[PDB]
Design a protein around this ligand. Structure first.
Ligand SMILES: CC(C)N(CCCNC(=O)Nc1ccc(C(C)(C)C)cc1)C[C@H]1O[C@@H](n2cc(Br)c3c(N)ncnc32)[C@H](O)[C@@H]1O
Ligand SMILES: [Br-]
Ligand code: NA
Length: 335
């Protein structure tokens, strides 16, 4: 029983792949995962990138065991020489840093490869195109929504957990949670979780704390939890009006400066407060459309945008102050 092995850049147990190399889905197989892993490790380590004939990496026979073993051996010899080099005066690769965005894309693709066996049991973008689509949206969102160790992040309806893992690897939040109700994605999420931790260690990279849970985010337990969350991500684009209504109710108890990022806005972008809409959620949040994923369209055929809501109760304060003022009250009461 033949196999291929890649040594970890930081001395974790090596990655082992049986020959013939597994096919993961229609566009992902182990051969190209191995090639990409080497390519990414080379990005981590200048010296490795120096030893490898980089353009030759594409001119390997992925169907030949000898050709692929030649590639792995070459990589492994070079890793050994790098570990020796670190024992000398040369300072080793800094440990427990966060992965670059490019590396993180590869790691999550790799985790998804080893975890999700049936993509068809899953339902703007599907999890199989995550790397080329949602990942970029999430990365853009991470860059725009600055988060600190005072934040708690929750992904409402977290599926197989991709968003949670991406955000946990990339930010400083105290904790990251994902909640998923359906058993198929929740089950896969357990594997996604184990694989992520394994692969993150394999590359020597750090992530913040996270928990992927089974549960219903509309439950009474989640009522209090949503209220104590400072950053919510929710892909609500296809949610019904009753679900969206229930979420608005839950968001209404969030603290000032709390933020919600969604694929469908929970309030109008140009909400203007008056006597008929006083109890509506637009009274207590700013809503802006964030920059789209340039050069990518949804299954709807349209560029995918995302909406940021910020809890801000001064909107309501200003409305009430104005009502006290007879000048402004007349100026408002002109319909
Ligand atoms: C459709 C979505 C809600 N989910 C996508 C899964 C992967 N997560 C994800 O994609 N998150 C995310 C993506 C992008 C963004 C931005 C930044 C681009 C806005 C933010 C978050 C679908 C999942 O939601 C679950 N779901 C549906 C309801 Br209804 C529900 C519920 N009540 N409780 C728990 N889970 C629930 C279902 O079981 C299902 O698995
Ligand atoms: Br529901
Ligand atoms: Na080189």
């Amino acid at each position: 029983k033949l196999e291929l092995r890649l040594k970890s850049p930081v001395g974790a147990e090596p990655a082992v792949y049986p020959w013939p190399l597994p096919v993961y889905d229609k566009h992902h197989d182990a051969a190209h995962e191995i090639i990409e892993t080497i390519r990414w490790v080379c990005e981590e380590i200048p010296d490795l990138k120096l030893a490898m004939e980089n353009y030759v990496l594409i001119d390997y026979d992925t169907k030949s065991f000898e050709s692929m073993q030649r590639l792995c051996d070459k990589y492994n010899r070079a890793i050994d020489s790098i570990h020796q080099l670190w024992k000398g005066t040369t300072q080793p690769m800094k440990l427990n840093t966060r992965p670059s965005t490019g590396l993180l894309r590869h790691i999550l693709q790799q985790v998804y490869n080893h975890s999700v066996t049936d993509p068809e049991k899953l339902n703007p973008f599907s999890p199989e195109v995550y790397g080329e689509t949602s990942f970029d949206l999430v990365a853009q969102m991470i860059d725009e929504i600055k988060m600190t160790d005072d934040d708690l992040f929750v992904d409402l309806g977290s599926g197989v957990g991709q968003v949670v893992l991406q955000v946990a690897a990339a930010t400083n939040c105290k904790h990251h949670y994902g909640v998923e109700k359906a058993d198929i994605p929740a089950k896969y999420a357990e594997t996604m979780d184990r694989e992520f931790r394994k692969w993150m260690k394999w590359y020597g990279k750090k992530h913040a704390e996270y928990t992927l849970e089974r549960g219903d985010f509309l439950s009474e337990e989640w009522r209090e939890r949503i209220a104590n969350t400072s950053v919510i991500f929710v892909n609500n684009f296809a949610f019904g009006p009753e679900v969206d209504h229930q979420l608005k109710e839950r968001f209404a108890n969030m603290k000032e400066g709390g933020r919600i990022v969604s694929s469908k806005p929970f309030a109008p972008l140009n909400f203007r407060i008056n006597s008929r809409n006083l109890s509506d959620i637009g009274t207590i949040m700013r809503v802006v459309e964030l920059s789209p994923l340039k050069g990518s369209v949804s299954w709807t055929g349209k560029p995918v945008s995302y909406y940021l809501h910020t809890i801000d109760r001064t909107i309501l304060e200003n409305y009430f102050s104005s009502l006290k003022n007879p000048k402004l009250r007349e100026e408002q009461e002109a319909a």
